[PDB]
Ligand binder design. Sequence first.
Ligand SMILES: Nc1ncnc2c1ncn2[C@@H]1O[C@H](COP(=O)(O)OP(=O)(O)O)[C@@H](O)[C@H]1O
Ligand SMILES: Nc1ncnc2c1ncn2[C@@H]1O[C@H](COP(=O)(O)OP(=O)(O)O)[C@@H](O)[C@H]1O
Ligand SMILES: Nc1ncnc2c1ncn2[C@@H]1O[C@H](COP(=O)(O)OP(=O)(O)O)[C@@H](O)[C@H]1O
Ligand SMILES: [Mg+2]
Lengths: 430, 427, 436, 427
Amino acid sequence: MGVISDAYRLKYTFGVDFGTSYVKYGPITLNEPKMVQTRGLFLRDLPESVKMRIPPDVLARGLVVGDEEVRKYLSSVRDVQRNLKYPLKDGVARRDDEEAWRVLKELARYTLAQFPVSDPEFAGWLVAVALSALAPDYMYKAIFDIYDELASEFKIYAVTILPQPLAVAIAENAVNCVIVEGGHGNIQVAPISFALIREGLVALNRGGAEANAITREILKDIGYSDIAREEYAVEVVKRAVGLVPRRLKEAIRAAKSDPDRFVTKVRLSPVVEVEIPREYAWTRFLIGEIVFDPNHEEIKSYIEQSRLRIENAVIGDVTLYGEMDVASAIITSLRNVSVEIQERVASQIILSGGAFSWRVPPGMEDVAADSVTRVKIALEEKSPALASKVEVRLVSEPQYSVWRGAVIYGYALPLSLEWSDTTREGWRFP
Amino acid sequence: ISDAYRLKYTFGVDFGTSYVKYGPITLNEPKMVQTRGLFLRDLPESVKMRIPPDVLARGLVVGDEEVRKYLSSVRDVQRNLKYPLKDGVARRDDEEAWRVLKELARYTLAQFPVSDPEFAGWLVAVALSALAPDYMYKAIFDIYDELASEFKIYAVTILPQPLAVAIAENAVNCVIVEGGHGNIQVAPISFALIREGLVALNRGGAEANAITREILKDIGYSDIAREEYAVEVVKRAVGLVPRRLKEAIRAAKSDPDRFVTKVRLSPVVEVEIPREYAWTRFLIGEIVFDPNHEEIKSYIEQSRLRIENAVIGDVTLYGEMDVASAIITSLRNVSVEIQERVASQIILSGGAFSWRVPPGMEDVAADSVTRVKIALEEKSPALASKVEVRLVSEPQYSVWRGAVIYGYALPLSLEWSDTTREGWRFP
Amino acid sequence: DKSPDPMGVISDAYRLKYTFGVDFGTSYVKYGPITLNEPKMVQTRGLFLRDLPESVKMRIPPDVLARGLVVGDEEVRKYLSSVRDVQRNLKYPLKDGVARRDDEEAWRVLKELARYTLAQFPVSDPEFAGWLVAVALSALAPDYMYKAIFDIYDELASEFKIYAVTILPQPLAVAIAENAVNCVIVEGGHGNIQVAPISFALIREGLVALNRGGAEANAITREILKDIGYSDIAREEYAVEVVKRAVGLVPRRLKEAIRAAKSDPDRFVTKVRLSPVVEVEIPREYAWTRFLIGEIVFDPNHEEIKSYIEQSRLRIENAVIGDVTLYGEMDVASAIITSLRNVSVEIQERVASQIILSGGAFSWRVPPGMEDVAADSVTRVKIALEEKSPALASKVEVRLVSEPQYSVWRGAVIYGYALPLSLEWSDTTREGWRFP
Amino acid sequence: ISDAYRLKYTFGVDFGTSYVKYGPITLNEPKMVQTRGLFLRDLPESVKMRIPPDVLARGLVVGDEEVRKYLSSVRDVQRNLKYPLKDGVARRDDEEAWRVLKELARYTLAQFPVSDPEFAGWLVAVALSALAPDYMYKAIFDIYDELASEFKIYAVTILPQPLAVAIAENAVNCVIVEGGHGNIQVAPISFALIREGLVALNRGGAEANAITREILKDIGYSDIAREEYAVEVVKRAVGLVPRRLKEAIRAAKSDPDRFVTKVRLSPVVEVEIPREYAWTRFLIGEIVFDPNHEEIKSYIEQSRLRIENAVIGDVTLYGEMDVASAIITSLRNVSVEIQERVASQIILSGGAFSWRVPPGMEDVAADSVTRVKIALEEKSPALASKVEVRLVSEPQYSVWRGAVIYGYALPLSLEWSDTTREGWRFP
Ligand SMILES: Nc1ncnc2c1ncn2[C@@H]1O[C@H](COP(=O)(O)OP(=O)(O)O)[C@@H](O)[C@H]1O
Ligand SMILES: Nc1ncnc2c1ncn2[C@@H]1O[C@H](COP(=O)(O)OP(=O)(O)O)[C@@H](O)[C@H]1O
Ligand SMILES: Nc1ncnc2c1ncn2[C@@H]1O[C@H](COP(=O)(O)OP(=O)(O)O)[C@@H](O)[C@H]1O
Ligand SMILES: [Mg+2]
């Protein structure tokens, strides 16, 4: 308990945000966290002409993680659904799923392995893990076991674990507000008092994943239906082209009356280039809009053919509303909160997550919309009295915010407090 | 099974479209034999009577030195001289082609007699063309199976050629461009062969001869052109590949004296390239890479030369597509994520690409790699900058070197399976 | 006591006894059973008795006269002396390798020779079931010749037991006899030198014929003999032969041998006894012409030969026999090169490696102590090829057979022995047996 | 007509220069009569009156026995005892010679009369000289024509003597050398007479007498030497042929007593060769063979002996050419291929070659054939080794023997032709 020293924690606090598509990790001393994709590749179903040219210690593990490694063998994998496990498909990994847990463990390892013991005074990391706000108790328990088990491979002094929206709040120094985390698998809207107000939390079954889904189905209509089968390329495209409308109707007609302004080409490789033709330039606004509002006629046409799915999900007690739009997700959250504090909590709305990292192209500000803009005018429409009083901002680095928060939390939480299965906060020590 | 055993008795056999390369791993380079058999069914009795009785009993002879003996006196060349791998694949209802392949497999093994009193059978890795369909893989296995009751052959495996080239070159991510007699095949390699990416052209060393033949007639050597053997000797000695076809033509027309040449064909026959025709040397090499030029099309418009497509099962062989665009088309049919790394390495193999630059011609003459680099410069400059193009060291022997490496490294606890497309079979 | 073998005629033992060869040369037929050491010879010619006086007719056996024709050297000679006109009653049926079909007299003689030939060898064994006869004909012999020869031996079946007949080209026969599979046969006859390349069989496209041979060597010997002053003995064709055999030499180089024989004539003068009463001598002044006699066979383009052509006393000219042109002027070196050029390139290496000289026309020998100026047949061809294509001469090995007349025959028996009797002759396959 | 008939009624007549030999084929040997007639041109009346008037009417007598009776009382013998074939041939303008020949042809047939009633006429073969020109052949035919109306003669033919001697000796290829009184003819026989080969010498029996006459004058018997009959009797009895004239002359000059000899000319007269002249016996025989000796030329330098050339039709008769060189000249005028064989056989016919060696002289003296062997030994030794020289069986019956064989064998459907020169005439 001289390990308590703020100087030691100022160097040896280790943050890990387990995102639904990307883990952000690294020590507190970093300026921005290292990232790796949350997924692992099982090597059970690889041919022997591929097996024989792989390091013997690697095959022994049977599971491979980390961007540069997974990319290596991905090309020659017989069945992608059996061997490329995304353990956090939607924030949570069902408990009886030994494969999902093998990957999470293997990630937790790869993560720590990247930063080795240097100092002879180093007595173990203080690891602060950020889990989804939807994570059931078994997850917190399983994560502690993972880090416990891993303690015999790396010096891990102490482990703690906090929900994501709280991490965003901490990183922003935001007290009374509404945090809106936008991931790949889900958007979660939590009202923050000083910690998370559980009763207020509202989750939507929609995110970066649906933005890809439409971009894929648009790419089938344009006639690149071979490049649309490849998930990697879809993402590249969604990032490169997609726009978010101020109003969907006013942007669609503006891009049909003036297509040549909205056409665009994307270099995917030295040999393949993808182009959005004049005929389909209007669809760019669908890519971004679907994250915010899925209740549009040109989207439901994609649902009536079995090519796009907007629907609900249940993860434990939590219902994730597939259809509910972002403005009403906020309103619903504040309505689940006590009236006395609705006043305060509403003044501040914070957007975090990759799903909201949309930019506007120079000279498009008349129909193209910023993330904050699209939400401000969604709220103008939905509840006008709310909108006039409310200040909406997106954080500076939307993917890094959760991590920043974890390390700040892992530095501030006093080590005299032990984790308690009922209190849901404190430290475990292996 | 002992590593000491596999380091000595691993046997490779490359079934090429024109030459089979074979031999044990202990060789410095593989023995070669022309992929062809001579049937003696239709021979005069004044030729049959001079032949050893046991030989006639077979009715079929293989191996360069034997075929050459009786070849001269063959009534009809088309019925009795079988080149089974005309264009990489041997059709299933062709009992004659399979008889030759079988007989070749034997001649091949006969060359190296059981010496050790401990030798209990070869471990044999056969390399077939990448175009070989499932029946071919099976039929080659039967052939080696049947031949077990003749030679000690413990274990048999079988891999595609492009893959073998990759292995010998120790290249994991690459584009193999194999250039044979019947066809140039362009296959991208991830770790094993990427099936969807393979692109084949219906051009090869054969078309370089076809033009060399029609050139030889215009010079007025129309007796020497009817003879297939001599043409080859000529296309080898004289043919050149241009930096640019159009831009090398002007160079050999303004200074013909530098580009005139003679070839000794025999003690008594010498063929010479006139000053007036010296420029056509550049056609011989160019056709392999690019058949889309005015002076080639004139030969096609007369029924004397054939640039055309072919279908062999699933695959189309594009007669017209040039080598630069064949590569881009290959990378286009491959996964986008990995196009980057696969393209970084283009490897040239095969005889069709073993052109050299005659000392003092480097201004208009081009070796194979040079011609591919500048083919890509034209087509997509963005591609050319990221890519590194090289020809293998020994263009014919490369496929074989890989086969021996594969048959040595592949673990024997893996059994061949019709669905997995890899492993050993045991006779 | 055993039964006589019915599969008896096929048995190697029977064939090693009753295989009968007959080489129809343009000047001499060589014939005989395989059992012989060397073939009996007979001159290819018949003497008609139609035009003889009665004071000579009356002194001839009645059955001989009845025939009106005789063959066989010892016979023809007996009655030749007393024949009024030799040019019409002495037929040499194979004047130049072939006898044209519209010539009933030529075929009569050939038949009569075929008979005389077989008559010489009688039915001794009681097991003998018929001869197996293999006829060698010239390479120039067109299909009708193969036919007419078959009929001749067919008709002769009602006279002699002849089980089967076959018939092969002479160049091929030489190859077989010399056990040379890849080679160039250069047959030197009386009427013509034919140069045939052999792969396994004769390469048809390759054959080159020269309209020149033993005949031309006589022809110049005749005109030289006239220049010396022997115009009576020069008229007599028998005597010309005797002289050409005895005196003729082949020069290493014609120009250099003439100089040699002109500066030292007495070295090259020579005499020949023709009969107890006649001796011919090549005088000092003409001694150098001995070299023209041998040279003309190989190379007729020399000023001192052309002088006899410029006067109308010697004729070097081309000839046509069916498909084939016989080049009168072409020298032997160039006839060879020309031949190999008409051959496939892949085999030119091996075919040229072996050059074999057959025929009497190449039976020239060097009188010992003249090997500095004089040259034998091969030596002359070797230096012919050295000059013409030195690239060729280095790779090539040139030899004359042992018995240059006996070679064709020797091959024929080997062929007629080895050819399996299960094979029938076929007009298009051009090989096999005919049975009468 | 019939073979049985010709075996009985074939009639031969050899018209020799000195004796006609005659008779039918059925004889053992022919009857002989001397070729001469005695003209009774004028006789006193006391002599005419004692002669059968039939005899006078003719004025000419033939037959040895007749001539001898009247010769005693005939005025001038040189003018009246005519020898028609004095020299092989009888001149055309000579009415008397033809009168004798005719009368002989008659006497000849008169000797054998018509016995059988089936006799239909003789078949008569006359052998004339080889020098006999066309007119003789005709005139002999006429003679036998005219005589048809006196004796039954069915057919006449007429062949040269050399041919006959050949036929009789059964010699096919040979050189017949006919040795006459007036001339020696050398005719080569292939199957028939080779006319171009025939060589004639203007010498023989006549010159042997000429010298014998001139020797008898030197001995001093100049009355007996002017008489022609006496000279013959002497040359026959004394004359010898030398092995070598030089070596035999010295032999008889050193030893005269060995070579002296006496001869009865009649019951009343005897002649003696003195010691001093004994050597000349050798000149008598030698002149026949070789007249080129100094001791013969000595008689020519005085105008008392004559050696010279003569023409009989086409042929020149060489007075000086010796018998050895006559033979070589003949064979050189024959085709070369048959020179070998024609020379192999030399046959001597005629009286001029009827010399014998008196026993105990065979060291210096030589018979006819011996003289020719050593004559040919000297001249062409190459010839002498190959050739066999002999005298016929009966030196005078040979010609006839042949004539009967020829007249028996010649097919009777062949007619004589002035151009072909063989066949039968019928009257
Ligand atoms: N520049 C961008 N434009 C649009 N979308 C982005 C961008 N960068 C990242 N994203 C999206 O954001 C998501 C990742 O955000 P993150 O907060 O890490 O969520 P997760 O918890 O799912 O990893 C991905 O679905 C990705 O497609
Ligand atoms: N030196 C050379 N120059 C040009 N072409 C060559 C050369 N050597 C061989 N070739 C060509 O290469 C082909 C044979 O090479 P290979 O790789 O064995 O082909 P395959 O795939 O038929 O076995 C032939 O068509 C021949 O024309
Ligand atoms: N010693 C020799 N010198 C030169 N030529 C000869 C010799 N002997 C024979 N001949 C020639 O050989 C020829 C006959 O032999 P051969 O080759 O069998 O010819 P053919 O086939 O016509 O019978 C004749 O032309 C003859 O001139
Ligand atoms: Mg996150």
